[PDB]
Design a binder for this molecule. Structure first.
Ligand SMILES: *[C@@H]1O[C@H](CO)[C@@H](O[C@@H]2O[C@H](CO)[C@@H](O[C@@H]3O[C@H](CO[C@H]4O[C@H](CO)[C@@H](O)[C@H](O)[C@@H]4O)[C@@H](O)[C@H](O[C@H]4O[C@H](CO)[C@@H](O)[C@H](O)[C@@H]4O)[C@@H]3O)[C@H](O)[C@H]2NC(C)=O)[C@H](O)[C@H]1NC(C)=O
Ligand SMILES: *[C@@H]1O[C@H](CO)[C@@H](O[C@@H]2O[C@H](CO)[C@@H](O[C@@H]3O[C@H](CO[C@H]4O[C@H](CO)[C@@H](O)[C@H](O)[C@@H]4O)[C@@H](O)[C@H](O)[C@@H]3O)[C@H](O)[C@H]2NC(C)=O)[C@H](O)[C@H]1NC(C)=O
Ligand SMILES: *[C@@H]1O[C@H](CO)[C@@H](O[C@@H]2O[C@H](CO)[C@@H](O[C@@H]3O[C@H](CO[C@H]4O[C@H](CO)[C@@H](O)[C@H](O)[C@@H]4O)[C@@H](O)[C@H](O)[C@@H]3O)[C@H](O)[C@H]2NC(C)=O)[C@H](O)[C@H]1NC(C)=O
Ligand SMILES: *[C@@H]1O[C@H](CO)[C@@H](O[C@@H]2O[C@H](CO)[C@@H](O[C@@H]3O[C@H](CO)[C@@H](O)[C@H](O)[C@@H]3O)[C@H](O)[C@H]2NC(C)=O)[C@H](O)[C@H]1NC(C)=O
Ligand SMILES: *[C@@H]1O[C@H](CO)[C@@H](O[C@@H]2O[C@H](CO)[C@@H](O[C@@H]3O[C@H](CO)[C@@H](O)[C@H](O)[C@@H]3O)[C@H](O)[C@H]2NC(C)=O)[C@H](O)[C@H]1NC(C)=O
Ligand SMILES: *[C@@H]1O[C@H](CO)[C@@H](O[C@@H]2O[C@H](CO)[C@@H](O[C@@H]3O[C@H](CO)[C@@H](O)[C@H](O)[C@@H]3O)[C@H](O)[C@H]2NC(C)=O)[C@H](O)[C@H]1NC(C)=O
Ligand SMILES: *[C@@H]1O[C@H](CO[C@@H]2O[C@@H](C)[C@@H](O)[C@@H](O)[C@@H]2O)[C@@H](O[C@@H]2O[C@H](CO)[C@@H](O)[C@H](O)[C@H]2NC(C)=O)[C@H](O)[C@H]1NC(C)=O
Ligand SMILES: *[C@@H]1O[C@H](CO)[C@@H](O[C@@H]2O[C@H](CO)[C@@H](O)[C@H](O)[C@H]2NC(C)=O)[C@H](O)[C@H]1NC(C)=O
Ligand SMILES: *[C@@H]1O[C@H](CO)[C@@H](O[C@@H]2O[C@H](CO)[C@@H](O)[C@H](O)[C@H]2NC(C)=O)[C@H](O)[C@H]1NC(C)=O
Ligand SMILES: *[C@@H]1O[C@H](CO)[C@@H](O[C@@H]2O[C@H](CO)[C@@H](O)[C@H](O)[C@H]2NC(C)=O)[C@H](O)[C@H]1NC(C)=O
Ligand SMILES: *[C@@H]1O[C@H](CO)[C@@H](O[C@@H]2O[C@H](CO)[C@@H](O)[C@H](O)[C@H]2NC(C)=O)[C@H](O)[C@H]1NC(C)=O
Ligand SMILES: *[C@@H]1O[C@H](CO)[C@@H](O[C@@H]2O[C@H](CO)[C@@H](O)[C@H](O)[C@H]2NC(C)=O)[C@H](O)[C@H]1NC(C)=O
Ligand SMILES: *[C@@H]1O[C@H](CO)[C@@H](O)[C@H](O)[C@H]1NC(C)=O
Ligand SMILES: *[C@@H]1O[C@H](CO)[C@@H](O)[C@H](O)[C@H]1NC(C)=O
Ligand SMILES: *[C@@H]1O[C@H](CO)[C@@H](O)[C@H](O)[C@H]1NC(C)=O
Lengths: 259, 393, 380, 97, 49
């Protein structure tokens, strides 16, 4: 579905503190009110190799880390070094190696559906680490992955960028109130991790962890917006938190505001 | 003024700026240390023709503990120097560790004769990688002789340089110089493959406050006065900029605290003098500076009068009120007058707008002049200035 | 300092150009001296500091909202305080600074010199002018101040605009009420609206923006590898770093020259405005002006100055005719073959009878030999 | 000292510097000329209104009540001798409207 | 447009010179507005035809 973001995709373009300043930056951003593809995190396995056109905005309304991690590279066949950001319920294992990628690298656990148990049909997410150049595992933390349906409060908005060989990940855990399509609001994304990997990324792919007769499709979806070189006018409050932004090319009124 | 006589007035002179007292450098802690210790203290290396290669990257390749150690016999850098090693950043460093007979150490030199050289590990003429060789006779010498390091590298098939003489009887503790086993490690590194991620350790100095110093925070260099700040940076923010996009706050990398930055005090210096012929006495004004700092750059003083326009030196302060003579600013004027008698000196005062007057206005009172005076006054106005034609060419 | 902040090599390179810095400093110093001279010329126009008597028996007129208020620490009037509050700075303290100038521009060799006359002194000058006016008419502008009751002063002004003083002496209470109401309306308008002081606000904003742009220009490469002198020096050897430093020096010198030229032109404009303000003070406050539309719209009666940040405010009091009646007029009158013309006034008729009246206020009177002078005969 | 192929750099540097100096001088002269023109217009008005006639404008032709003025040429300027009437001795009386 | 008329490379090079173009545009716009102000002040002196 061709969903449209409203004011999401705003992240701190740098590490500078500004108070009560209307700074204007010319950096990669998600254009306001832009068509963002809507997928079905489910026989029908939605998991393609979507293009990575100089940045990607990833958002989702999943819980317990349904979408584990991501794959980056240009060949994605172990012929060229490829990043593997495969996350689990404990910690991320960010790893750049010429890892061999299976055609269907997804855990496939039919957990708590009929048998009321956690069973692992196969473990083909990993195929082989034939050749590697760098790896980094973070601390074994524990995110709020515990099963709590209630009302979704995990809008794990993400932004991935690759400039001058540096891989940047901006993220922010913004709780929401409506389980329906992306909500209305404003929330800047703080930087999370930076890496001097330096490889060339042309495509990217998502990873999932979840026979065809009467299969109850999983209820989860993730959006994939695209960044684009644009000029924004960011408002910093007294505490130096971006409270509002203006897309200086959205419409004549916004252009005047920026001017 | 390029003159030997100066007229009454106040003249600007060389600007005054407080110089930095000391240089302060702050950097994050050096924690990610490369596996140099394990690479150089391995129990045993592979064969000379099967030298083991270990990639060293994403760390600090400190050499202080390396060079200073006296346990080494030979260590030469043919492309770099230990002095500049710390101040150089490497993209990636590879360590090739192997054990060879003492004689082969000569062959290890780049561009040296001996087919063994290019059979096992050839060194190209442009190899800048540092090489470390240290005697390990006891470690690598067996009682009966270590024959694993066979030296039959005369294979019929030719092995070209970087394609990818059985004079040793047995390594014994009695082996003389040149024949004992030697532990050789090569510090081969490359560039133009990835963003730089290997750099030498960076020193750190102590922190000082309320003193004009030359700071350097994570490569952010500048001069100013560091002061404890009440600002609240976010965890990921380092610097603090102003409306004019000028740095004004900083976060100390070691201790996560926010320090304000204030430019070192500075301002113009003005000399207040009456006519040269009248006298040679003068008084100086340090514009926009309090003279708790003036003596840094008449140092003794004996007359300091803090005014809103800067501290005044050499002028007596009197709370009479006269017509302004030499303007100073913020409602202060200077003049040359006697009285205490004699000792004609320069005085400072708050200028007087004029004699107070109170008209005797009343409901039914009028004052009518009974006499007049004819007054003639002169007014001057420029009308033109000298013509001037210039031949540009 | 601006071009080569703390860089001996950059200073040595700047020595090549040499006297440009001296030229710029001379121009800016001239501008500052001009500013002080402008304020002096506009305000310092009284040889003595007159002060109003304690008893404010001004014939029913009420000046409480323009005379000084001793209660406040700064002896400013109600309206002067209103103006000072309305005009607000943009960048930071110019001022009320109890410390360093405390501005962003201070980081780069930019300093703001305080004005020679403090706001308290400007207010004192304004108070002197106002008290001298209300207590002695226009006489204090020509010589020693001579007292005169305010009602009589207003009668003189009315005579000046061509209305007989009996009009004022008979409508004194109404005129006083109207004047007080007008003053109150002015106070309310200033208190409520915010675009009244557009000119002063624009001056302040222009200066702040000019300084801000000047400081912002320090972050431009101007074709060099980087905009940080220390960065260039540490990253390049001197023989080539001299080229980059020269590029930066050229760029920053051009920025300074542009700023100084803009300041010179703006100072010319401000000097023109200050000369106009001084002329208005001299001709409307110190006296009564016959020039049309100069001191306000309508027939001028008087004016009162009020000091505002970086400017002055005049409260022009003017006389405006209100209600008109249609009449029939004749240039002259024939009595006995002689043509009688009005001495001062005009002949009017309400429809059946003829009268002679002053031209600016309907006060009919019998046509007698005192109001008219004979000249010639009828037929001409 | 240098040959034609290599003297253009030096000549260009000198040309740039001297042209900048000339432009600065000309702009300064233009601004000064505008100021002098304002002053000269004021002087012409003062002549027309104080010498050729009697002025009622206060403090225009000198302090006090203006009577007459006399012009006197000066180098690159003019000098006016404003003759004015000034009340001197005031005796205060009771008055009624 | 005047300096780098229809040239992305020239525009990118010019962007390194700061706010010179913005200052020039502001100056010319100020002059243009002041012209209308002059005509208004001179002629529109009576609000009744
Ligand atoms: C233009 O203006 C003139 C003057 O106002 C008008 O002419 C009239 O003149 C008289 C005064 O002379 C005005 O008031 C009247 O006074 C009378 C006494 O004065 C003598 O003259 C009038 C006529 O002028 C004679 O009629 C009169 O007999 C006298 O010999 C009064 O007698 C009049 O009537 C009553 O007046 C008062 C009340 O106000 C009573 O107490 C009296 O007892 C008397 O009964 C009158 O008062 C008169 O107003 C004028 N008329 C007008 C219309 O104004 C012109 O007429 C006027 N033209 C126009 C078109 O208005
Ligand atoms: C001349 O014009 C002035 C402005 O109109 C007049 O000042 C007004 O005078 C009246 C009373 O005479 C005030 O009404 C009072 O307001 C106070 C407000 O608290 C304080 O401020 C007033 C200001 O005058 C002061 O009078 C009070 O005593 C207090 O100190 C109320 O508390 C009272 O109850 C009463 O309402 C007006 O506030 C005051 N200003 C205005 C805008 O009206 C002045 O009286 C005139 N002088 C004359 C006619 O001689
Ligand atoms: C010339 O212009 C003057 C100002 O416009 C006029 O003075 C006004 O004349 C009226 C009538 O005499 C006065 O009103 C009188 O006094 C009070 C005022 O309060 C009332 O005000 C208006 C009328 O003005 C009324 O509609 C309100 O409801 C109030 O009740 C009241 O007791 C009466 O209205 C009474 O008529 C005005 O006060 C007065 N204004 C001023 C500032 O003095 C004058 O009449 C005009 N004509 C002439 C020949 O002078
Ligand atoms: C971020 O911006 C806000 C608004 O400018 C700053 O105001 C502070 O916000 C906090 C709310 O958490 C206030 O604390 C609260 O105070 C009330 C009243 O005392 C108390 O009842 C609550 O329990 C809570 O403690 C705080 O008073 C208020 N002012 C200050 C000086 O903190 C806020 O400071 C900024 N936060 C930063 C820079 O971290
Ligand atoms: C293998 O391990 C031994 C220690 O058991 C090393 O002996 C070292 O010899 C050098 C002097 O030649 C000294 O190094 C020292 O390092 C430590 C920090 O690790 C510190 O005391 C000084 O910085 C000093 O430089 C010291 O005598 C000793 N080092 C230690 C830790 O005991 C031997 O050098 C190692 N051989 C390798 C890595 O090839
Ligand atoms: C670089 O190394 C230091 C060393 O840990 C890191 O911070 C340090 O944390 C210790 C915690 O014990 C601080 O010691 C403190 O001593 C005071 C003495 O009164 C005591 O009251 C505290 O409870 C604490 O024990 C130590 O002062 C502190 N030093 C610094 C420079 O922060 C530091 O975070 C590391 N910085 C980086 C960029 O890695
Ligand atoms: C002003 O004159 C008085 C004396 O003259 C009287 O007041 C004038 C205002 C005017 O109305 C004259 O016609 C009066 O005859 C001077 O001082 C006065 O002295 C007398 C005698 O002691 C006394 O009755 C008054 O109260 C005094 N009034 C004042 C104001 O002093 C006064 O010196 C003259 N000059 C000034 C500036 O007031
Ligand atoms: C996700 O990452 C965690 C923690 O790193 C994994 O737990 C260990 O991870 C390291 C490195 O991947 C392995 O060497 C260990 O064998 C792991 N041990 C165990 C008991 O898991 C964890 O396995 C990963 N996956 C999940 C679902 O937690
Ligand atoms: C992949 O395996 C090969 C060794 O079989 C190595 O790749 C070398 O990496 C270095 C550094 O980039 C290059 O200089 C060599 O040219 C590479 N050789 C070959 C044959 O590719 C390394 O062990 C692994 N590198 C990666 C990216 O996986
Ligand atoms: C992906 O990017 C890399 C470089 O980022 C390309 O490899 C070469 O990199 C050097 C320096 O960056 C360039 O000078 C070469 O021109 C690059 N090679 C080519 C053919 O352009 C690499 O080519 C890019 N494409 C892929 C599939 O990796
Ligand atoms: C100004 O008058 C004051 C009188 O107070 C003098 O200033 C101080 O006055 C008190 C005593 O009354 C003492 O602090 C000193 O006698 C004075 N201190 C200083 C620094 O002057 C002062 O003598 C007079 N002259 C000035 C201020 O210039
Ligand atoms: C120069 O040094 C003196 C030292 O006292 C400063 O005096 C301070 O003035 C401010 C303004 O009111 C006060 O807040 C301080 O308490 C005063 N004492 C100190 C120690 O600062 C003076 O202000 C300084 N001049 C400046 C900053 O311009
Ligand atoms: C964006 O989405 C809306 C509706 O989803 C659609 O009408 C519009 O054509 C889309 N824009 C583009 C460029 O596809
Ligand atoms: C439940 O267990 C059976 C095997 O006993 C398996 O065939 C089936 O796929 C499982 N279903 C789910 C939802 O786990
Ligand atoms: C001013 O200087 C001249 C030359 O020295 C001297 O003749 C004259 O007396 C001086 N006037 C003074 C000190 O008043």
């Amino acid at each position: 579905a061709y969903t449209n973001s409203f004011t999401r995709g705003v992240y701190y373009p740098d590490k500078v503190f500004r108070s009560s300043v209307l700074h204007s930056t010319q950096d990669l951003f998600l254009p306001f009110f832009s068509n963002v593809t809507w997928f079905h995190a489910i026989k029908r396995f939605d998991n393609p190799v979507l293009p990575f056109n100089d940045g990607v905005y990833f958002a989702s309304t999943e819980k317990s880390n349904i979408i584990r991690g991501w794959i980056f590279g240009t060949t994605l066949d172990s012929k060229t070094q490829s990043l593997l950001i495969v996350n689990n319920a404990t910690n991320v294992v960010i790893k750049v190696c010429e890892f061999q990628f299976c055609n269907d690298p997804f855990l496939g656990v039919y957990y708590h559906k009929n048998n009321k148990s956690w069973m692992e049909s196969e473990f083909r997410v990993y195929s082989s680490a034939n050749n590697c150049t760098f790896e980094y595992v973070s601390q074994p933390f524990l995110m709020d992955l515990e099963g709590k349906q209630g009302n979704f409060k995990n809008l794990r908005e993400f932004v991935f960028k690759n400039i001058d060989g540096y891989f940047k990940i901006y993220s922010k855990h913004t709780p929401i109130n409506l389980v329906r399509d992306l909500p209305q609001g404003f929330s800047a994304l703080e930087p999370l991790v930076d890496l001097p990997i330096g490889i060339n990324i042309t495509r990217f792919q998502t990873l999932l962890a979840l026979s065809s007769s009467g299969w109850t499709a999983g209820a989860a979806a993730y959006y994939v917006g695209y960044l684009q070189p644009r000029t924004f006018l960011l408002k910093y409050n007294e505490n130096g938190t971006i409270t509002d932004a203006v897309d200086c090319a959205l419409d004549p009124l916004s252009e005047t505001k920026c001017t | 003024l390029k003159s030997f006589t100066v007229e009454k007035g106040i003249y600007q002179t060389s600007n005054f700026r407080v110089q930095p007292t000391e240089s302060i450098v702050r950097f994050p802690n050096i924690t990610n240390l490369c596996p140099f210790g394990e690479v150089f203290n391995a129990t045993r290396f592979a064969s000379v023709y099967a030298w083991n290669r270990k990639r060293i990257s994403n760390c600090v390749a400190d050499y202080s503990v390396l060079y200073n150690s006296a346990s080494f016999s030979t260590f030469k850098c043919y492309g770099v120097s230990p002095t500049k090693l710390n101040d150089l950043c490497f993209t990636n460093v590879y360590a090739d560790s192997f054990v060879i007979r003492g004689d082969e150490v000569r062959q290890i030199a780049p561009g040296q004769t001996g087919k063994i050289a290019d059979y096992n590990y050839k060194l190209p003429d442009d190899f800048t990688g540092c090489v470390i060789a240290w005697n390990s006779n006891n470690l690598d010498s067996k009682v009966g002789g270590n024959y694993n390091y066979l030296y039959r590298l005369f294979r019929k098939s030719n092995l070209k340089p970087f394609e990818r003489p059985l004079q040793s009887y047995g390594f014994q503790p009695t082996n003389g110089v040149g024949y004992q086993p030697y532990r050789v490690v090569v510090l081969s590194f490359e560039l133009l493959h990835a963003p730089a991620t290997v750099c030498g350790p960076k020193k750190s100095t102590n922190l000082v406050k309320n003193k004009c110093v030359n700071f350097n925070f994570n490569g952010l260099t500048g001069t100013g006065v560091l002061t404890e700040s009440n600002k609240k940076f976010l965890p990921f923010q380092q610097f603090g900029r102003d409306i004019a996009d000028t740095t004004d706050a900083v976060r100390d990398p070691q201790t996560l605290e926010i320090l304000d930055i204030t430019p070192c005090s500075f301002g113009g210096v003005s000399v207040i003098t009456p006519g040269t012929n009248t006298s040679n006495q003068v008084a100086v004004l340090y514009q926009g500076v309090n003279c708790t700092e003036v003596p840094v750059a008449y140092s003794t003083g004996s007359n300091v009068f803090q005014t809103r326009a800067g501290c005044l030196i050499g002028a007596e302060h009197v709370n009479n009120s006269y017509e302004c003579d030499i303007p100073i600013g913020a409602g202060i004027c200077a003049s040359y007058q006697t009285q205490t008698v004699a000792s004609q000196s320069i005085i400072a005062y708050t200028m007087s707008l004029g004699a107070e007057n109170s008209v005797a206005y009343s409901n039914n009172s009028i004052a009518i002049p009974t006499n007049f005076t004819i007054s003639v006054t002169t007014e001057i106005l420029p009308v033109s200035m000298t013509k001037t034609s210039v031949d540009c060419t | 300092m601006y071009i080569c902040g703390d860089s001996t090599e950059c200073s040595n390179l700047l020595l090549q150009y040499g006297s440009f810095c001296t030229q710029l400093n001379r121009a800016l110093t001239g501008i500052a001296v001009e500013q002080d001279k402008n304020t002096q010329e506009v305000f310092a126009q009284v040889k003595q500091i007159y002060k109003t008597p304690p008893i404010k028996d001004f014939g029913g007129f009420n000046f409480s909202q323009i005379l000084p208020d001793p209660s406040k620490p700064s002896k400013r009037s109600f309206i002067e305080d209103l103006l000072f509050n309305k005009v607000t700075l943009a960048d930071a303290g110019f001022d009320i600074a109890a410390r360093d100038l405390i501005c962003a521009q201070k980081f780069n060799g930019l300093t703001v010199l305080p004005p020679l006359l403090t706001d308290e002194m400007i207010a004192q000058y304004t108070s002197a002018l106002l008290a001298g006016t209300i207590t002695s008419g226009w006489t204090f502008g020509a010589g020693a101040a001579l007292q005169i009751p305010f009602a009589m002063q207003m009668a003189y002004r009315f005579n000046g605009i061509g209305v007989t003083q009996n009009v004022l002496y008979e409508n004194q209470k109404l005129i006083a009420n109207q004047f007080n109401s007008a003053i109150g309306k002015i106070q309310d308008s200033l208190s409520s609206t915010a675009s009244a002081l557009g000119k002063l606000q624009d001056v302040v904003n222009q200066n702040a923006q000019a300084l801000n742009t000047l400081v912002k220009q320090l972050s431009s490469n101007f074709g060099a590898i980087s905009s940080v002198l220390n960065d260039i020096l540490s990253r390049l050897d001197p023989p080539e770093a001299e080229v980059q430093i020269d590029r930066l020096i050229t760029g920053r010198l051009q920025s300074l020259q542009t700023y100084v030229t803009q300041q010179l032109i703006r100072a010319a404009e401000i000097r023109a405005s200050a000369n106009l303000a001084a002329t208005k003070m001299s001709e409307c406050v110190l006296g009564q002006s016959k020039r049309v539309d100069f001191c306000g719209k309508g027939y001028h009666l008087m004016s009162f100055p009020q000091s505002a940040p970086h400017g002055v405010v005049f409260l022009h009091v003017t006389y405006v005719p209100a209600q008109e009646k249609n009449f029939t007029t004749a240039p002259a009158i024939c009595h006995d073959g002689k043509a009688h013309f009005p001495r001062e006034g005009v002949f009017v008729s309400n429809g059946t009878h003829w009268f002679v009246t002053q031209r600016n206020f309907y006060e009919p009177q019998i046509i007698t030999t005192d109001n008219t002078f004979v000249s010639g005969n009828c037929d001409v």
